[PDB]
Amino acid sequence: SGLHILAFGAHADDVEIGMAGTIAKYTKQGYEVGICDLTEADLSSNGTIELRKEEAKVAARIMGVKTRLNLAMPDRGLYMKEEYIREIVKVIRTYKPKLVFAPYYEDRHPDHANCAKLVEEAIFSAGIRKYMPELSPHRVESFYNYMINGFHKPNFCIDISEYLSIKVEALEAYESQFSTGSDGVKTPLTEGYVETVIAREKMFGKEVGVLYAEGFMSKKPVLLHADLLGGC
Amino acid sequence: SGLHILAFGAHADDVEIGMAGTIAKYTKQGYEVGICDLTEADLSSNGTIELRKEEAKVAARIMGVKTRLNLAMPDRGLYMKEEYIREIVKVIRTYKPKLVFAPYYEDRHPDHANCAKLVEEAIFSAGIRKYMPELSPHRVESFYNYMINGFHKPNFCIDISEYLSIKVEALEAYESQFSTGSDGVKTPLTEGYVETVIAREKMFGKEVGVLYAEGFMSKKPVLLHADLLG
Amino acid sequence: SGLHILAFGAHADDVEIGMAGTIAKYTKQGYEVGICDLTEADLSSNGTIELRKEEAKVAARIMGVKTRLNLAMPDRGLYMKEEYIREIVKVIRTYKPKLVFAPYYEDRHPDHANCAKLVEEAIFSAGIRKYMPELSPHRVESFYNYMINGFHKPNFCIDISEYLSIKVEALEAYESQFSTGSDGVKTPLTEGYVETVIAREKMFGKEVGVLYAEGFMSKKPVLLHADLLGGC
Amino acid sequence: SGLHILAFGAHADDVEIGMAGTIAKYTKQGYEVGICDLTEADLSSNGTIELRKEEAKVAARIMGVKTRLNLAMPDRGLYMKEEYIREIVKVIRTYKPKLVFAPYYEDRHPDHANCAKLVEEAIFSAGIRKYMPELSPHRVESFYNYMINGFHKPNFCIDISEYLSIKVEALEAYESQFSTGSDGVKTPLTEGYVETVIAREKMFGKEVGVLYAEGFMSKKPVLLHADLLG
Amino acid sequence: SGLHILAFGAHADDVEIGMAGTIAKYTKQGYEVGICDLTEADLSSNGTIELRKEEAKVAARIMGVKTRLNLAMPDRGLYMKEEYIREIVKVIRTYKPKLVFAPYYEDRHPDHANCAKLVEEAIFSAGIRKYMPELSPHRVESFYNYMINGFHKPNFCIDISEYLSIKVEALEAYESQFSTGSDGVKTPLTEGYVETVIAREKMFGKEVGVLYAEGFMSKKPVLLHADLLG
Amino acid sequence: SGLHILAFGAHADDVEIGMAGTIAKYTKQGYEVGICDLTEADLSSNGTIELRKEEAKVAARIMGVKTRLNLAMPDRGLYMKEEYIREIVKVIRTYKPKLVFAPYYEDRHPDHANCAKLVEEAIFSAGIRKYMPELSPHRVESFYNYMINGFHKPNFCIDISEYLSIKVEALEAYESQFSTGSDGVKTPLTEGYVETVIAREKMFGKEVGVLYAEGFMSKKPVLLHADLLGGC
Ligand SMILES: [Zn+2]
Ligand SMILES: [Zn+2]
Ligand SMILES: [Zn+2]
Ligand SMILES: [Zn+2]
Ligand SMILES: [Zn+2]
Ligand SMILES: [Zn+2]
Known part of the structure; x- marks a missing residue:
């Protein structure tokens, strides 16, 4: 039928850091979310690719994510390449996600911006x-x-x-x-x-009058319907 | 008992320009929306206070707004004054709005920023x-x-x-x-x-994938719950 | 002698959307403007490349554009490539444009930013x-x-x-x-x-006290001489 | 009959720092430029009101400014006051300037922002x-x-x-x-x-491909006509 | 003779929230830090002026602040008034601070911006x-x-x-x-x-490679000398 | 032991324009700074590569720079390439710089942004x-x-x-x-x-209450310790 959310990360744990709480919140409501890790994070100082993949599976089950993919693109190699866009387009077209998430570009780890850029290109070409x-x-x-x-x-x-x-x-x-x-x-x-991740969410939480909130960026204004006055 | 929305403007038509569509959308759903205009727009180039008051009533009716107030503060006199803040505080405390709207400050008409500034101070003090x-x-x-x-x-x-x-x-x-x-x-x-107002709403509409949308500013991040996935 | 304006688009219709009014205004005053489409927009959902090229010719004549080029770079393929910069440099050096226009980068269609980036690089290398x-x-x-x-x-x-x-x-x-x-x-x-395009121009028009205005971005401050107090 | 440019400053020398070059450029072309200083800079560390008034006349002469006014509002007292707005409104309505200039608000001297704020309110009310x-x-x-x-x-x-x-x-x-x-x-x-002022103008100059340029801010987009292609 | 740091807040606890860590860090090094709260926070939902004054003394003690002043200006009444500016000018001239701190204006509590605005005007006039x-x-x-x-x-x-x-x-x-x-x-x-305050400092800390850091805004570029290479 | 500062430029003179004063200030205090020019600026309208390299040596000695490298990457060719990142990583790992400087991206010369981007990627991968x-x-x-x-x-x-x-x-x-x-x-x-360079430094100087100051950008907040109240 199609995923409600497909979240991309450069490395397994990216999506978790950014939005594990949101994912858990919505999978619990019965929404289908998938995660696509672009790389196996082979250059991570600790662990192995296999261990990382196993941890990604454990994390996925915790978040109620039933679909997790790894595109096995090179860690520190997320250059703007046709072949990579093609691979992500294939993912987007296969899983037909209503929403797509990727890392925000303003990030000390260049893979994160590079992931977002690839995903943006792929989203456009997917249509x-x-x-x-x-x-x-x-x-x-x-x-x-x-x-x-x-x-x-x-x-x-x-x-x-x-x-x-x-x-x-x-x-x-x-x-x-x-x-x-x-x-x-x-x-x-x-x-x-x-x-620090908890701290950020506490900080964002206070901003919106809740204990913990995850923060997101959107190039377009968010469209409010039910959330203006509540009631769902 | 309290209003769902109280929208402030400096002059009658302000709220309409900004959000008549949103107000109409939500009053049709049964939400209670009030409008409070800070002034009677006494210095408007065209019309009179008389005509403007009647037009504001017609506009309110069109929008399904049952409560429209005017504080009769001086047009072009919306200075940051305690007296004005307290009048607006009275309004907020009387009508107990869940949401308050006011003009965005980045606006060629200084009353609009001045209105927003007064309302912001009043919102804080109202609590x-x-x-x-x-x-x-x-x-x-x-x-x-x-x-x-x-x-x-x-x-x-x-x-x-x-x-x-x-x-x-x-x-x-x-x-x-x-x-x-x-x-x-x-x-x-x-x-x-x-x-131009229609044009703007067309532009905002296109940006979010609809025919017409009204645009709003929020100092805090928007909290999504139902609108993320609909 | 050299073009007064050379406007680049990724796809034929880009330049029109951004500045058909400006182009028409200045060609009518006798200024020479050219348009260079980087691609033939082969991935456009509707039409064919030939039909698109024919429409580009019709549009050009409406705008009083006497020079229209297509560099036949790939739609959705405007990567930062030496060969593409070279091709645009060749165009710039051939037509010696006083002003160059390209799409603004903040745009949902990544080709538009990519076009602007190529053109920026080419402009610099052209000199x-x-x-x-x-x-x-x-x-x-x-x-x-x-x-x-x-x-x-x-x-x-x-x-x-x-x-x-x-x-x-x-x-x-x-x-x-x-x-x-x-x-x-x-x-x-x-x-x-x-x-929506008309709406934008109406919106920009109101900003500057006219019915319809086209809006432009410039990395440098615009230099005013005659337009400060008018009179030309 | 009306001025082409009326430039406001908080203190005499403000307009000069910001735009003496532009003023000189345009007065030489036969345009009428007026300067209105809001205060007599009564609190300036060096000089006196007396000396400053004379210097302002010398500066005006140098710039080809035939009209220089001083509203003698309090130095460091440019509060958002109705009385001050109306004095500035009188000036704008008397001299009917096509363009009005004032200091940019992002400035270590609060009078400069305060001047700009007063002038903006006055411009709006003048109409x-x-x-x-x-x-x-x-x-x-x-x-x-x-x-x-x-x-x-x-x-x-x-x-x-x-x-x-x-x-x-x-x-x-x-x-x-x-x-x-x-x-x-x-x-x-x-x-x-x-x-430093020369340095800035050198910097702005380089940015636009000239030796020296004065920089200006505009809340609305600049409207180009003749200056696009010259 | 003069304070190294004078930190202004609108209400007692403001300076603590913003910079108790920095104040403590520098008082421990032997620097003299003073705090001036503009109001007695008379309108605070919880507590009384009495309790708040005592708490402010306890907080000052904890931070190693030997000088704490309160100007007893109206809570929620920090309007841009000459009288208030001059009271703050008196404070700055009395205590001769090398550095002055005040709340950042982008803050849901309007008193905080209002405090900063007053202090900025006062700093300028103090000189x-x-x-x-x-x-x-x-x-x-x-x-x-x-x-x-x-x-x-x-x-x-x-x-x-x-x-x-x-x-x-x-x-x-x-x-x-x-x-x-x-x-x-x-x-x-x-x-x-x-x-949340700890959370913020954790966040700022991580950004600069330490466990906890307090964040500050400066209108002018920060001048580095010893801190470039340590 | 390791450089205190390694400053990258696209072309020899970049680092000088941006920070010759800072470099001279700190080399005089006994800090070790190196400069790495990415290209030989072969496309410079005036001079030759050899002359440029000789001028770079003269400039280095004036600034008290004891280490100057040229990576001989192509002028106008600082594309985001693995090989270039690799070369810069090698430099960073060899000279172990405490601080790294590169051009600010908002610059009419695209090589400057491109240099900064390469250096940013290399800095991350270096660790x-x-x-x-x-x-x-x-x-x-x-x-x-x-x-x-x-x-x-x-x-x-x-x-x-x-x-x-x-x-x-x-x-x-x-x-x-x-x-x-x-x-x-x-x-x-x-x-x-x-x-113009002197003018900028005069302008920045006035901002901070000194005669001449060089201005720098930092993605992270600067950490103050001794410079808050002085005394070193
Ligand atoms: Zn990652
Ligand atoms: Zn209005
Ligand atoms: Zn296009
Ligand atoms: Zn001044
Ligand atoms: Zn407070
Ligand atoms: Zn260079």
């Missing part, structure tokens, strides 16, 4: 019939950006107060990334990173 | 029990700005595609403002102004 | 003698951006009130793009798009 | 017939801001390459301001200030 | 000899803004990793503000506010 | 152990941008009042670039350019 005509076109309704590193004034927020614990659980599934363990090394991700 | 303790306090949930003159990248939009006709009717209620008539003088408001 | 020394260098005086999709606060406007009908005519020349016809499909361009 | 109905209204065509302290990405520039010398002469007319002399104290204005 | 000539003038070196409500991309940060505990202690001194207690009502300040 | 594992990783502490063409509100300034003459000397070392001579041609660099 073009004559492009890759072997697959039926799909028009994504909206493209939004979640935040990985740092913070920005969000265009919109999703209240994740009831789902923060699940987000932390989803994040903690990436043991290799955010914890040293027995043979791991100290990285920015190991040293108070998950705490 | 403060110790302030004007004779009148029970009220906490407004959200404060949004609509656009009168010009345009800005909206923080959010309301699809008014079905209500554009009603918006135009509500605007046209101000015949003294938007038409020269036979005795009136040419103003920015008579020279393709209503057409 | 470098040692670059492609087989063609004499040319220094473009100013590079401005017109708007295709959406809207932005313009850095400057051109009053096109007297030329709006001609702009609409130029736009309507692209029957395949903005009208369904007998065998066309519904796209964002077919559903109230031309009306 | 309103019912406001101060004893004096015929005037509609200003465009309102632009010049820069005094610091710098900003200009919305537009005026090539003043031929008039930099005149600008420097006009600035140097304020010897009490830009030089310590023999009894004066060190201020931001004495410590390489004129050199 | 003007002819203004209030009975009291020797003082030139403040730099004016910075700290953040109370919300967050902004800071122009600069101060590493407060070692002083977060002291900041929390200083905030917790305002038990009447940040806890409902047993008789108090729920406010934005009682609902995970201190946790 | 990744598994990337190019033959060289030990290096974490650059901070990345800042200097300004070449035009001007921007600086995030921070360095007082160069005492070192302006040295900056002018460093700039004047590029005789081929900023002076016509006997067989040179008129370019934007020859016509009041060095004067």
